[PDB]
Amino acid sequence: EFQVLFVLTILTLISGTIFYSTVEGLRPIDALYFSVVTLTTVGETPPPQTDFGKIFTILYIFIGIGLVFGFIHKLAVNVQLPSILSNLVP
Amino acid sequence: EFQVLFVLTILTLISGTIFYSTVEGLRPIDALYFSVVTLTTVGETPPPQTDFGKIFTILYIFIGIGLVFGFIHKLAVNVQLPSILSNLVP
Amino acid sequence: EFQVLFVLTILTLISGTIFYSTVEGLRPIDALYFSVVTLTTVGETPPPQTDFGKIFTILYIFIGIGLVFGFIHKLAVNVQLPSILSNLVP
Amino acid sequence: EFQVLFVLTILTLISGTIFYSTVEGLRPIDALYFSVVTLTTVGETPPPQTDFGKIFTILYIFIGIGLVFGFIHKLAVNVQLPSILSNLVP
Ligand code: NA
Ligand code: NA
Ligand code: NA
Ligand code: NA
């Protein structure tokens, strides 16, 4: 499960990285950062400058937020929880 | 269900698009983008400049966030999940 | 229930409005808008300029987000849902 | 439970405060504020300026959001709820 969500999230981020680096002309690292803060709703970034960027962002958000949060919902509950939980055992 | 939420979300976005393009004077595409990042809480945009814009945004958020997230909660769980889940079957 | 959450949310917003209008020197409407986008995590606004503003925002977020979202979780599910749901009955 | 989440959240914020104050060169209070609005997805702040800041933010978000929201989910439901709920008793 966690393995799958990880894959789906990575592919989603890869797509955003390629899109933004090409259409908005961002360096790869900035394109990945934009993709990440967008899908997690953190939004610490100015908006895309092109209409293509805006249209894609709208669609990217609706399709990717569900996935990204489903993944985060497992990263801390199915992997990060026990580590400290089972560790909460005397 | 998914069909209904889709309709309710579209109408909500249409209302925001009309509102912002008129009161804040944004081009339709920018008004739709503002509406979308606002309701998904992504917030990658500067705030409205008019008091009408601010008041409407406050009300728009409280009434639309619940709907938009309910829709997203189905777009990936009732439509996007199986596609890859049922596809996870050897 | 909905009545109570409404009260708790209003008081929370009133507190933020008073705080920001005084410490950050914002007009009441802008102080309320800042309070609202902050607690809903929309964040369509520049950050507070004073250390008092920042410290208060940190505490305001942790204490108010839970409440605000609990309220929204009822505004659309206990009030906005039926209106269109019961209306989905032929 | 609430005691534990409080500890995990504090350590997470301490790490972010140290990181941002050092790499992005922010005063401690601004580093803590950035860490807080980032992990709660409020995002009321400009993005990091360095690639290290961006890479760390990406990882910080994925690992810390789950924790921070789990904590908030208890701060208002296991501590803030009764206070006013049990108080809702005539
Ligand atoms: Na958010
Ligand atoms: Na945000
Ligand atoms: Na934001
Ligand atoms: Na923002």
Automatic annotation (TrEMBL), chains A, B, C, D:
Subcellular location: Membrane
Potassium channel domain span: 8-77
Transmembrane segments: 4-23, 52-72
GO molecular function: identical protein binding; metal ion binding; potassium channel activity
Entry GO terms, CC: membrane
UniProt keyword Aminoacyl-tRNA synthetase, yes or no: no
Keyword flag Transmembrane helix: yes
Record's protein name: Potassium channel protein
Organism: Bacillus cereus (strain ATCC 14579 / DSM 31 / CCUG 7414 / JCM 2152 / NBRC 15305 / NCIMB 9373 / NCTC 2599 / NRRL B-3711)
